Design a protein around this ligand. Structure first.
Ligand SMILES: CCn1c(=O)[nH]c2ccccc21
Ligand SMILES: CCn1c(=O)[nH]c2ccccc21
Ligand SMILES: [Ca+2]
Ligand SMILES: [Ca+2]
Ligand SMILES: [Ca+2]
Ligand SMILES: [Ca+2]
Lengths: 146, 87, 87, 146
């Protein structure tokens, strides 16, 4: 929980992601807007709880040192290999460890934000290690997180 | 850079929920035990009543724990967003 | 009797949430990988953008998983209540 | 997932816990009332999801065979030792494995539904194995779940 100088500056840029009206303070209302922009749906009480956790002086909003002081407690990261593998497993229809190149293109061009058929070409070129038209997604994810 | 890594995981309203529910787990654990192991003559109406209260208390504590995990991941979402600026 | 034992643990709206979010985990995993390992010249604005989209997708899947666990324990509460009548 | 005769009869009694108006059907509205009586707060969508899981014919409510058919899938139980220990740990102020007899009486006579000071006497008589005025709650819980 000790933060460098450069990280203090980058987190000032981060604060602007949250402080939508730039009035120097993050409110439950701004936090709701941000969380929903990230596809989550926190309740009023959850928003107040998130503020109350980093709200040192109890004035109902988060300022920059409450915001910074708080990042310091959570700088530790961890790899996402297993979570990413589980995302691929969603499309593993037969539960056999494989997704065909054809099914991958079909997923990536129809679901979520999507890739172009050409972006999919690049992804499959990397993913299909054996050139057998099949993606061993455990191996591909291990390659990307190495 | 951080690449694909993300923040590593792991109130008063919830705090009150925890102490009341936990006391009731103790209450009903004790009363089920007494009524099933320390009596000459088991009264099943009594056991059923305390089994209902026991399960409600246990599931209240589970509910609090799940909400804590949810809150923790909501906060970790915000920390993750802030960390994109480290790139 | 069952004494202190309880039911052992472990939608379309959530199903759609899962497929869209999972596809986006694949999308952004790929695009971060490409932009950090397969380019001559890393574009950090690009990496930041896809890191934001990656974390949102990962946390959407976590949200679904947590809701599933919550639903499962709500159903287990009802099964536990019904099981009190077995006493 | 095979249910006996006697268990089918006892679960009919169970159905009445849910079917509040005894009209033969459990609705989201009745399920809300029941879940709240148990100190939970499911949302409308969660209530509909719980019905939709056991709602074989898609008519929006649960009948007895949807209700029974469904119990069959979840008859397996498991011991609650660790969960019960964790409930005691809530009152382990110093995190030392012990709660004093005095603190136990204080908890049990003030929090939750409560015990009488006399019921607490019986509980402590069993819990304080060593007669040292201290409760090793891990040992006590193991005794009660044996
Ligand atoms: C510093 C990142 N963060 C939390 O951990 N909880 C927050 C609540 C409001 C704003 C940012 C938050
Ligand atoms: C048979 C117990 N039970 C569930 O498992 N889900 C339910 C939904 C409504 C009523 C009872 C339920
Ligand atoms: Ca503001
Ligand atoms: Ca504050
Ligand atoms: Ca009814
Ligand atoms: Ca039905």
């Amino acid at each position: 929980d000790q933060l460098t100088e450069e990280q203090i500056a980058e987190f000032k840029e981060a604060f602007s992601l949250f402080d939508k009206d730039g009035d120097g303070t993050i409110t439950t209302k701004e936090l709701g807007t941000v969380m929903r922009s990230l596809g989550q749906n926190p309740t009023e009480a959850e928003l107040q709880d998130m503020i109350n956790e980093v709200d040192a002086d109890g004035n109902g909003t988060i300022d920059f040192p409450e915001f910074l002081t708080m990042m310091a407690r959570k700088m530790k990261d961890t790899d996402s290999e297993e979570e990413i593998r589980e995302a691929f497993r969603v499309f593993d229809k037969d539960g056999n460890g494989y997704i065909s190149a054809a099914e991958l293109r079909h997923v990536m061009t129809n679901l979520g934000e999507k890739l172009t058929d050409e972006e999919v070409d690049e992804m499959i070129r990397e993913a299909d290690i054996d050139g057998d038209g099949q993606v061993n997604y455990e191996e591909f994810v291990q390659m990307m997180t190495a | 850079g951080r690449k694909l890594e993300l923040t590593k995981a792991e109130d008063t309203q919830l705090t009150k929920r925890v102490k009341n529910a936990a006391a009731n787990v103790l209450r009903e654990t004790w009363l089920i035990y007494k009524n099933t192991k320390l009596v000459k003559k088991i009264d099943h109406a009594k056991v059923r009543k305390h089994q209902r209260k026991f399960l409600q208390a246990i599931h209240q504590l589970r509910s609090v724990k799940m909400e804590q995990r949810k809150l923790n991941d909501q906060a970790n979402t915000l920390v993750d967003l802030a960390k994109t600026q480290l790139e």
